[PDB]
């Protein structure tokens, strides 16, 4: 199960 | 035994053709058992171990909006990124994600990663208390900040010590007749005559399960690598992995050596001869 | 940084002249993942290569397997060819049935 946390860059 | 698995993510840019490639695969073990191409007529998550297939309709869409939104969100990272270091317009540049988790014999957490490259470089990555972050350089730090501000790091752990082992666990229950079995090498050595005075000895390792393996050549019994050519350990295609060390000795002493074979696969060392 | 990449051409099982068999090509340590490979009978491009899926190691570098059905025979010829930005020509190495 991939994650799916929100991303930042 | 121990267990692991991890996703690996790559979105390559390719200025003037397109919009930046995102592809991700997953695994348990040595076992890919997932992959996303965004390249694909029709991008989703497939299956590539038999014992995933059985995940129901809402796994895969689950799965495949979860790629989908990952592609859009390391195009923004690249595009960031870019950003940052005040590249040129000019060529492709990369941003990879390495994520999972280990368990132990006992089935617990016994270390949790996330770690992000830019253009095949260390970036940043989550340290090994899922709390805080390492930043490899100025543009990286950047990044912290917007994290640590995000609270990105809490999420990640939640995940880390939930999600990715229970899933794990189950994973390992619904394949365990592969992925907790062990496939012993098939060896063996052939002969190669350079000339009349010298020949190649070769020993192979075939069909073995998982990758790790320890090849080695000894004379009269006593070890001698620096003389021993290897190849890197590969895959058969099957799921299974090849590996041969060659060493070029006198016509008349091929007696003298010895190949010797350890894999988890074998009850015990094994020891060929040509 | 590019990185040049490193190929691997062999077998799935021990090869044996008129027996069906799969041959490998292993190509690895090569950066970006950027990367065009075709296989070559007798010197002419093959039609179905499959292709693995990109993956990448540890030191970041990524490693795809590419393979086709083949019938190894006395004098058919067999290479992997690729091309690759860290290059400048492209790279083709021959199976030899021993390796």
């Known amino acids: 199960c991939t994650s799916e946390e929100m991303n930042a860059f | 035994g121990s267990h692991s698995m991890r996703y690996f993510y790559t979105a390559v840019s390719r200025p003037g053709r397109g919009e930046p490639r995102f592809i991700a695969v997953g695994y348990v073990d040595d076992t890919q058992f997932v992959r996303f191409d965004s390249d694909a007529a029709s991008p989703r998550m497939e299956p590539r171990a038999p014992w995933v297939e059985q995940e129901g309709p809402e796994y895969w869409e689950r799965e495949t909006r979860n790629m989908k939104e990952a592609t859009q969100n390391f195009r923004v990272g690249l595009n960031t990124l870019h950003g940052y270091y005040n590249q040129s317009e000019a060529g492709s540049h990369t941003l990879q994600r390495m994520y999972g988790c280990d368990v132990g014999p006992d089935g617990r957490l016994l270390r949790g990663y996330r770690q992000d490259?830019?253009?095949?470089?260390?970036?940043?990555?989550?340290?090994?208390?899922?709390?805080?972050?390492?930043?490899?350089?100025?543009?990286?730090?950047?990044?912290?900040?917007?994290?640590?501000?995000?609270?990105?790091?809490?999420?990640?752990?939640?995940?880390?010590?939930?999600?990715?082992?229970?899933?794990?666990?189950?994973?390992?229950?619904?394949?365990?007749?592969?992925?907790?079995?062990?496939?012993?090498?098939?060896?063996?050595?052939?002969?190669?005559?350079?000339?009349?005075?010298?020949?190649?000895?070769?020993?192979?390792?075939?069909?073995?399960?998982?990758?790790?393996?320890?090849?080695?050549?000894?004379?009269?019994?006593?070890?001698?690598?620096?003389?021993?050519?290897?190849?890197?350990?590969?895959?058969?295609?099957?799921?299974?992995?090849?590996?041969?060390?060659?060493?070029?000795?006198?016509?008349?002493?091929?007696?003298?050596?010895?190949?010797?074979?350890q894999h988890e696969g074998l009850a015990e060392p094994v020891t060929l001869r040509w | 940084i590019q990185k040049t990449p490193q190929i691997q051409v062999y077998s799935r099982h021990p090869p044996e002249n008129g027996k069906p068999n799969i041959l490998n090509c292993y190509v690895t340590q090569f950066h970006p993942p950027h990367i065009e490979i075709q296989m070559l009978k007798n010197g002419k491009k093959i039609p179905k290569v499959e292709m693995s899926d990109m993956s990448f190691s540890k030191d970041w570098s990524f490693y795809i397997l590419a393979h086709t059905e083949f019938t190894p025979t006395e004098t058919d010829t067999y290479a992997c060819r690729v091309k690759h930005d860290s290059m400048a020509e492209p790279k083709t190495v021959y199976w030899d049935r021993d390796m």
């Not at chain 2, 000339?195 to 080695?216: K, M, N, Q």
């Not at chain 2, 290897?230 to 590996?243: H, I, L, M």
């Open chain 2, 117 to 261: 490259a830019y253009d095949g470089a260390d970036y940043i990555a989550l340290n090994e208390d899922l709390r805080s972050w390492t930043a490899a350089d100025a543009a990286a730090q950047i990044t912290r900040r917007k994290r640590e501000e995000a609270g990105e790091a809490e999420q990640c752990r939640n995940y880390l010590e939930g999600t990715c082992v229970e899933w794990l666990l189950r994973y390992l229950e619904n394949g365990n007749e592969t992925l907790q079995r062990a496939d012993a090498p098939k060896t063996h050595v052939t002969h190669h005559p350079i000339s009349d005075h010298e020949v190649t000895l070769r020993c192979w390792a075939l069909g073995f399960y998982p990758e790790e393996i320890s090849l080695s050549w000894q004379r009269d019994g006593e070890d001698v690598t620096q003389d021993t050519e290897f190849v890197e350990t590969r895959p058969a295609g099957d799921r299974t992995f090849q590996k041969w060390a060659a060493v070029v000795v006198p016509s008349g002493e091929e007696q003298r050596y010895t190949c010797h074979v």
